[PDB]
Amino acid sequence: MKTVLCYGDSLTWGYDATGSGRHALEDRWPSVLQKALGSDAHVIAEGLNGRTTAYDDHLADCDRNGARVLPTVLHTHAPLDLIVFMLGSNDMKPIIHGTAFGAVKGIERLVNLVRRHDWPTETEEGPEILIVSPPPLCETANSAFAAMFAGGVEQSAMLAPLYRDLADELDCGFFDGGSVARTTPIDGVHLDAENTRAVGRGLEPVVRMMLGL
Amino acid sequence: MKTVLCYGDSLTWGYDATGSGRHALEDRWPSVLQKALGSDAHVIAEGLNGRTTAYDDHLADCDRNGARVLPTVLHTHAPLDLIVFMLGSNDMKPIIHGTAFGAVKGIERLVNLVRRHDWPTETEEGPEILIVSPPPLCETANSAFAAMFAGGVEQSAMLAPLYRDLADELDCGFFDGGSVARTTPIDGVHLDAENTRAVGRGLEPVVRMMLGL
Amino acid sequence: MKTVLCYGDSLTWGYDATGSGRHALEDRWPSVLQKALGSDAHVIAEGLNGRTTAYDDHLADCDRNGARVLPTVLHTHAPLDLIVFMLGSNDMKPIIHGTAFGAVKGIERLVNLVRRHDWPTETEEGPEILIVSPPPLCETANSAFAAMFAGGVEQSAMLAPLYRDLADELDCGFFDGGSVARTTPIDGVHLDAENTRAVGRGLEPVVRMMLGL
Amino acid sequence: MKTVLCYGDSLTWGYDATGSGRHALEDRWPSVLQKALGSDAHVIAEGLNGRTTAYDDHLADCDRNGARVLPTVLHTHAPLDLIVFMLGSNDMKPIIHGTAFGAVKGIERLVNLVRRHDWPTETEEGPEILIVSPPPLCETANSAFAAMFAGGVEQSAMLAPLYRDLADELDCGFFDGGSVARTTPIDGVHLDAENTRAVGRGLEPVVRMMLGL
Amino acid sequence: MKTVLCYGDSLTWGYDATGSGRHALEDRWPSVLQKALGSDAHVIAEGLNGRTTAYDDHLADCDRNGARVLPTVLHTHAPLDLIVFMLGSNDMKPIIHGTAFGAVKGIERLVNLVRRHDWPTETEEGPEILIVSPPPLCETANSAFAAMFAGGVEQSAMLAPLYRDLADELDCGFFDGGSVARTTPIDGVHLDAENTRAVGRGLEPVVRMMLGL
Amino acid sequence: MKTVLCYGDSLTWGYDATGSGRHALEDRWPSVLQKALGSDAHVIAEGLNGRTTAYDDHLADCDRNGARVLPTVLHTHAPLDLIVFMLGSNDMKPIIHGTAFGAVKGIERLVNLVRRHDWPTETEEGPEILIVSPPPLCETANSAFAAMFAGGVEQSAMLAPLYRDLADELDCGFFDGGSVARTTPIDGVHLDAENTRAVGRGLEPVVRMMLGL
């Protein structure tokens, strides 16, 4: 049985912007993926609202630095056959840094953290790694969000090509989330239930391919 | 559907001391518990080898301080109907502090962290909390472990009464893991597959009662 | 006897831009408030030079992140009847982030830290919270300050309406410091002695309302 | 006008072993000292429950490491003429270390933090420093306190001679708190209102001498 | 025998923009300086790739905050007669802050860390300090570097005048690295072996004067 | 040219207990090693007073936790052919934990940090590692040191066999420092000049074997 860790942010937690709540379990993209793989895989969802690739954010009751937390998560869930990353939307906040390029460097650090992890028990081989570019940000009239993410429509559109290029450099899998799903203008960043499911459905082929099914 | 977070250490990760590996999924105590509750619950396993209640340990590629990490875990998995804690065995290490009493103060801090958590979305009510005393340590001839855990047979036997008393003070549920399961002398701390399953089976009644089924 | 905590930056410390020293005790705004309230209240001044709302700044011999520090301050001075915040001027520094919106998010975090604090002795009545928008930045010939706070005159002008909107959203009091006081052009950011006294006199009515005298 | 910082733990916060509450303001030791000195001095009380000399403790909603926190506190209250420390009780907990010697080394570190602090504004001359040994622990039937402070009766009796020797070595003032006050057997470590008040008065003469009145 | 600490970033580590490797030992600037000074001095090279003046950067397997790390480095190498800093290039990254002004404030903080360091053994007299502005960035067709350092050409040209003014303010030595060396257009920021060697030689005269030979 | 990193504590710094200062350069063990190897090797000395294997100590102006610091040191000095560890004396302090077993676990962690380090430039050949057991503690009349290291004579005697067993388990080299050198009874823990030189001379053969000269 293959074990798949899904390491993400609110898009992976399953933020429902319509209701200001959480999508149902069955609508979260790791759950869609699990259903599709069935008993051949065990998928673990680790989605944290506001998680950045590598940067500190002290505005919530959690540690939002993806890189600082990842070793603890890897160790909790080892041994792992596949890590699926979907991060970068929070990196588009100017407070964090706002740059597509800083997001791709953060993913690079996360890839290295997986590759160099000191596993809890003796482990022959590195997990495989799938880098997913999140669905790009959209324009919103929500004044708080448009400030929070000022300039991020334009920068977030550059994540797919950069993340694809990194995945090629680092021998990782790549999927463009924005190829199957769009964000909502309620806030410019979140996915409704249908678009969240779509990410899960869309990943099934590359996930199967990376796992040898 | 009720959501149950199981926050523990190697006993919850499912450490196989016979094989120096991880118990199969179906033998881990959260998985036994999930099977028993079926579709009425969604159980989330967060077991980290070497996790202490509240103390730092820099000897592995993770953060083993249960209290520092817990907010991030709570936030990842909210909203939660029940938190089940099973920690304290690592607190028996003299390097950490070695005292049953320090372990119960650490559980107290963890209870407070749940109760005061700033949830990712609007939340009316605190989760319920179930404090589980881990199966007590046994004597071992393994010289590394007997040093690591020097004096912990005697101190670990005091966790059940202290944890029961705390649970009464704080309006938490209580279960003695050591009432259904024993540790293995391979290393004096771990649970074999059968004893791990037993913890899961044994918790089903109090978990159902706390969840209203 | 009501206890009031005043949590702020060099404006609350009492920075004298003319002498590069500290205003006399009696000219600091918390002192002016205390004299106005008399023996009905005990006012505690916690102003730290360079303190930001919720952002790291490693340029001085102290932790300038207001959010990281605040729990320890709350705990030291508990039980509290009112917390008065006056922060955001340092958030106007580009190196911090330079945005009004980032400042009001930081105040939001501070409010939540108060509301969720695990008080040292049983409580049960939450403190009241007063959000004070600092007097906004002005233009200065001081080239070092003009650089340090580049863009800040325009952003700081936005703090009063954003803070007022937040106070309303979160059930806090609001006062616009800039309604009674102005910054000195010697450096664009500080208050002279009279302007520091004006803040303290200006807060007396809203402070009484919130304390029931 | 001389400014005095009082940097301590629950004995300085003013902990009531009975009510489980806070001593009234006028019954706290820095308040007694303030009343004695009158307008010749401004006394600032910074007493945090559980504060250690220089050791982490993650069991409460605050940073209990005296050393970490002290630069922030110094910077907040500068310029200072005198720092009065009264710490060491918490160091008697086996979870912290439980040794008089570790406490005096902690005090040393706090002394050096004062001496090397990079003050907010230009400052010629260091503050004076007064080291206070806390009143020693006594035996208690309170079994949680007896556990928490196990061994502390015998170790805490060593604080006064070690602290006095250090003060001599480092050119600091010294006062033995236990000379004028005793702990309550209600819990073995705290001070009742009368004995708290006595510390403040007892310190008056040495504070006066160090300050030239 | 004088001891000189060289505290820098990849320009001091000796980064080869081509080979993506390390300059040979004799081609690094502190080695050149050492060879020039001969047995009158012992030069210690502490160059860390990506090191900033006083800003966190979690993108590599190390702490890149110059300020955090420097007390440890000072303590390791004390007693020191001279500290030579060459930092600021990394501060030109928009992810760090991207401002010449933020870099000079960072340098200031490093100067004060040297001046206030609590040396391992008794030490009368501070080390001398030499601030080196790094050679300024140049334009590059390398699109990853151009992104990473966007804006840095124009800002890095301001480092020399700001650093010189600071050195005057703080009674430090100053040298403009860009006076004797140029960055490579291969990536816009690094130094080839010849230009690296030139910094070391260029520093010789001012190092000699500060040390009295 | 081989590069050798020497990572240790005040024994590697070169602490002179008679003068409370630092041994001359030429008497420090890494210097003696360097002279013995000549131009075939470049030896880097990183000895920090009070450094522990993997444990926090906040009593000085530095980070004494060997494991927290080591990645930054590896990264600064990479690429390395050999890392030589000489640590554990500070681990014999009760405040740290006082156990030989805790010291060898800390060395274990350090070894793993080396083996998993994300080197700054492509590598691919792992450095060799030499574990050196420090000369064991002796009895002393110095009452402050006798307290600081209470129990340490008996525990430190156990470091050589435990370290040798570890070296064998992990494929590292081993040398017993105590085979060529002894501690001074002036304070029980330090080495005088000749005894520090003896360590350096003593390591030459195993250092050559591991470097292939």
The full set of domain ranges for chain E reads 1-213
C-alpha B129, offset from chain centre: 12
Max alpha carbon distance in chain C (Å)? 52
Token reading at D191: 């001070």
CA closest to A109 among chain F residues: F118
Token reading at E117: 């360091």
D55/F contact by beta carbon, under 8 A: yes
User: C-alpha angle with apex C107: C105 to C110, nearest 5 degrees?
Assistant: 115
The answer to whether the beta carbons of residues A133 and A88 sit under 8 Å apart is yes
Q: Which amino acid is at F17?
A: A
Q: Do chains F and A touch (3 or more CB pairs under 8 A)?
A: yes
Query: Which residue out of E16, E121, E122 would a mutagenesis test of the F interface target, given it has the greatest number of F Cβ atoms within 10 Å?
Result: E121
Token reading at F192: 């005088």
> Which residues make Cβ contacts (< 8 Å) with residue C74, sequence separation at least 6?
C5, C80, C83, C113, C114, C117, C119, D61, D62
d(CA A101, CA A148): 18
Helices (H), chain A: 10-13, 29-37, 66-77, 100-115, 143-148, 152-156, 159-170, 193-211
Taking Cα atoms as reference points, which of C174, C47, C205, C41 lies closest to residue C104? Answer: C174
E7/C contact by beta carbon, under 8 A: no
d(CA D12, CA D189): 12
> Which residues make Cβ contacts (< 8 Å) with residue A119, sequence separation at least 6?
A74, A75, A78, A79
d(CA B121, CA B75): 10
The answer to whether the beta carbons of residues D66 and D28 sit under 8 Å apart is no
C-alpha F108, offset from chain centre: 13
CB < 8 Å to B147, chain F: 99, 101
Taking Cα atoms as reference points, which of E66, E95, E83, E157 lies closest to residue E119? Answer: E83
Query: CB burial class (10 A; 0-12, 13-18, 19+) of residue B205?
Result: exposed
CB < 8 Å to D61, chain B: 112, 116
> Which residues make Cβ contacts (< 8 Å) with residue D213, sequence separation at least 6?
D40
Q: How many CA atoms lie within 13 A of C69 on its CB side?
A: 28
Other C-beta atoms lying within 10 Å of the C-beta of residue E103: 31
Min distance F45 CA to chain E CA atoms (Å): 9
Query: Which residue out of D68, D97, D105, D110 would a mutagenesis test of the F interface target, given it has the greatest number of F Cβ atoms within 10 Å?
Result: D105
Range D113-118, long-range pairs (CB < 8 A, 24+ positions) = D113/D67, D113/D70, D113/D71, D113/D74, D114/D70, D114/D74, D114/D83, D115/E118, D116/E116, D116/E117, D116/E118, D116/F61, D117/C61, D117/D71, D117/D74, D117/D75, D117/D78, D117/E116, D118/C60, D118/C61, D118/E112, D118/E115, D118/E116
What does residue C160 show for φ and ψ, rounded to 5 degrees? -60, -50
CB-CB under 8 Å, D42 with C62: no
Resolution (A): 1.8
- Burial string for D168-197 (b: 16+ CB within 10 Å, else e) reads eeeebbbbbbbebbebbebbbbbbbeebbb
- Burial string for E152-191 (b: 16+ CB within 10 Å, else e) reads bbebbebbbebbbebbeeeebbbbbbbebbebbebbbbbb
Taking Cα atoms as reference points, which of E162, E186, E189 lies closest to residue E176? Answer: E162
d(CA B87, CA B103): 8
Report the phi/psi class of residue C98: left, alpha or beta, with left for phi > 0 and alpha for psi in -120 to 50: left
Token reading at E15: 């980064």
Q: Do chains E and B touch (3 or more CB pairs under 8 A)?
A: no
Min distance F101 CA to chain B CA atoms (Å): 7
CB-CB under 8 Å, F20 with E48: no
d(CA A70, CA D124): 47
Which three-class secondary structure state does DSSP give residue F105?
helix
C-alpha A156, offset from chain centre: 14
CB-CB under 8 Å, E54 with C148: no
Question: Crossing angle of helices E100-116/E66-77, nearest 10°?
Answer: 30
What does residue F184 show for φ and ψ, rounded to 5 degrees? -90, 135
Taking Cα atoms as reference points, which of D181, D198, D200, D196 lies closest to residue D22? Answer: D196
Query: Which residue out of A93, A105, A112, A165 would a mutagenesis test of the E interface target, given it has the greatest number of E Cβ atoms within 10 Å?
Result: A105
The answer to whether the beta carbons of residues F158 and F100 sit under 8 Å apart is yes
Supply the DSSP symbol for A8: E
CA closest to B122 among chain A residues: A21
d(CA E173, CA E112): 14
C116/B contact by beta carbon, under 8 A: yes
Taking Cα atoms as reference points, which of B34, B56, B53, B58 lies closest to residue B44? Answer: B34
CB-CB under 8 Å, E59 with A106: yes
- Token look-up 């001075």 returns C77
Token reading at E73: 């480095």
Min distance A44 CA to chain B CA atoms (Å): 9
Number of residues that this document lists for chain B: 213
Q: Do chains D and C touch (3 or more CB pairs under 8 A)?
A: yes
Torsion of CA C91, C94, C97, C103, to 10 degrees: 20
d(CA C116, CA B124): 14
Q: DSSP assignment of C63-111, as one string?
A: --BHHHHHHHHHHHH-S-SEEEEE--TGGGSTTTT--HHHHHHHHHHHH
d(CA E57, CA A56): 10
CB < 8 Å to E65, chain C: 58
Q: DSSP assignment of chain E, as one string?
A: -EEEEEEESHHHHTB-TTTSSB--GGGSHHHHHHHHHGGGEEEEEEE-TT-BSS----SSSS--BHHHHHHHHHHHH-S-SEEEEE--TGGGSTTTT--HHHHHHHHHHHHHHHHH---SS---SPPEEEEEEPPPP---S-HHHHHHTTTHHHHHTTHHHHHHHHHHHHT-EEEEGGGT----TTTSS---HHHHHHHHHHHHHHHHHHHT-
d(CA C192, CA F37): 66
CB-CB under 8 Å, F47 with E76: yes
Token reading at D154: 């015998």
Q: DSSP assignment of C166-182, as one string?
A: HHHHHT-EEEEGGGT--
F48/E contact by beta carbon, under 8 A: yes
Q: Which amino acid is at A127?
A: P
Which three-class secondary structure state does DSSP give residue A96?
coil
- What SS3 string covers chain D? CEEEEEEECHHHHCECCCCCCECCHHHCHHHHHHHHHHHHEEEEEEECCCCECCCCCCCCCCCCEHHHHHHHHHHHHCCCCEEEEECCCHHHCCCCCCCHHHHHHHHHHHHHHHHHCCCCCCCCCCCEEEEEECCCCCCCCCHHHHHHCCCHHHHHCCHHHHHHHHHHHHCCEEEEHHHCCCCCCCCCCCCCHHHHHHHHHHHHHHHHHHHCC
CA closest to F111 among chain A residues: A118
Which three-class secondary structure state does DSSP give residue C22?
strand
d(CA F14, CA A163): 49
C-alpha A4, offset from chain centre: 13
Number of residues that this document lists for chain F: 213
d(CA A202, CA A29): 9
d(CA D14, CA D28): 5
F115/B contact by beta carbon, under 8 A: no
Q: Is the dihedral of CA A165, A166, A171, A174 positive or negative?
A: negative
CB-CB under 8 Å, C147 with E109: no
Q: DSSP assignment of B144-157, as one string?
A: HHHHHTTTHHHHHT
- Token look-up 């009742």 returns D192
Q: Which chains touch B (3 or more CB pairs under 8 A)?
A: A, C, D, F
CB < 8 Å to B60, chain F: 109
d(CA F97, CA D94): 11
Query: CB burial class (10 A; 0-12, 13-18, 19+) of residue F84?
Result: buried
Other C-beta atoms lying within 10 Å of the C-beta of residue B63: 20
The answer to whether the beta carbons of residues D136 and D178 sit under 8 Å apart is yes
Min distance A112 CA to chain F CA atoms (Å): 7
The answer to whether the beta carbons of residues C146 and C188 sit under 8 Å apart is yes
> Which residues make Cβ contacts (< 8 Å) with residue F159, sequence separation at least 6?
F88, F100, F103, F104, F133, F134, F136
d(CA D30, CA D35): 9
CA closest to B59 among chain F residues: F109
Taking Cα atoms as reference points, which of A143, A140, A155, A150 lies closest to residue A190? Answer: A140
What does residue D130 show for φ and ψ, rounded to 5 degrees? -120, 115
D66/F contact by beta carbon, under 8 A: no
- Token look-up 């100590």 returns F57
d(CA E156, CA E98): 9
d(CA E22, CA F42): 15
d(CA B134, CA B151): 16
d(CA A179, CA B35): 37
Query: Which residue out of D58, D140, D145 would a mutagenesis test of the B interface target, given it has the greatest number of B Cβ atoms within 10 Å?
Result: D58
Paired with E29 in beta bridges are none
The answer to whether the beta carbons of residues F149 and F99 sit under 8 Å apart is no
CA closest to D59 among chain B residues: B109
Supply the DSSP symbol for A133: E
CA closest to E93 among chain C residues: C95
Other C-beta atoms lying within 10 Å of the C-beta of residue E139: 11
CA closest to B109 among chain C residues: C118
The answer to whether the beta carbons of residues D135 and D175 sit under 8 Å apart is no
Min distance B151 CA to chain F CA atoms (Å): 14
Taking Cα atoms as reference points, which of C209, C181, C211 lies closest to residue C27? Answer: C181
Taking Cα atoms as reference points, which of F171, F168, F199, F167 lies closest to residue F183? Answer: F199
CB-CB under 8 Å, C117 with B116: yes
Token reading at C55: 């952002």
Taking Cα atoms as reference points, which of C58, C133, C140, C138 lies closest to residue C88? Answer: C133
Min distance C194 CA to chain A CA atoms (Å): 34
Number of residues that this document lists for chain C: 213
Which three-class secondary structure state does DSSP give residue F26?
helix
d(CA E131, CA E153): 20
> Which residues make Cβ contacts (< 8 Å) with residue D124, sequence separation at least 6?
none
Which three-class secondary structure state does DSSP give residue A99?
coil
Which three-class secondary structure state does DSSP give residue A10?
helix
Other C-beta atoms lying within 10 Å of the C-beta of residue E125: 7
Fold (topology level) of F1-213: Rossmann fold (3.40.50)
d(CA E63, CA E70): 11
A118/B contact by beta carbon, under 8 A: yes
Min distance F102 CA to chain E CA atoms (Å): 23
Q: Which amino acid is at E127?
A: P
Query: CB burial class (10 A; 0-12, 13-18, 19+) of residue C213?
Result: exposed
d(CA B14, CA A20): 36
- Burial string for F46-63 (b: 16+ CB within 10 Å, else e) reads bbbbbbbbbbbbbbbbbb
d(CA E86, CA E145): 20
d(CA E95, CA E105): 17
The answer to whether the beta carbons of residues D188 and D146 sit under 8 Å apart is yes
Paired with B85 in beta bridges are B7, B131
Paired with F8 in beta bridges are F47, F86
d(CA E27, CA E8): 15
Q: Which of B65, B99, B116 sits opposite D58 (nearest CB)?
A: B65
d(CA C203, CA E50): 47
Q: Do chains A and B touch (3 or more CB pairs under 8 A)?
A: yes
Number of residues that this document lists for chain D: 213
Query: Which residue out of E95, E97, E145 would a mutagenesis test of the A interface target, given it has the greatest number of A Cβ atoms within 10 Å?
Result: E95
Report the phi/psi class of residue C151: left, alpha or beta, with left for phi > 0 and alpha for psi in -120 to 50: left
Q: Is the dihedral of CA D175, D176, D177, D181 positive or negative?
A: negative
C residues 133..152 contacting E (CB < 8 A): 144, 147-148, 150
d(CA A26, CA A44): 13
CB-CB under 8 Å, D109 with F60: yes
Q: Give the containing element (helix H, strand E) for F148.
A: helix F143-148
Token reading at B83: 């938190």
Q: Which amino acid is at E48?
A: L
Torsion of CA A19, A20, A26, A32, to 10 degrees: 120
Rounded alpha-carbon distances, angstroms, from residue C170 to C108, C131, C210, F24: 8, 10, 15, 64
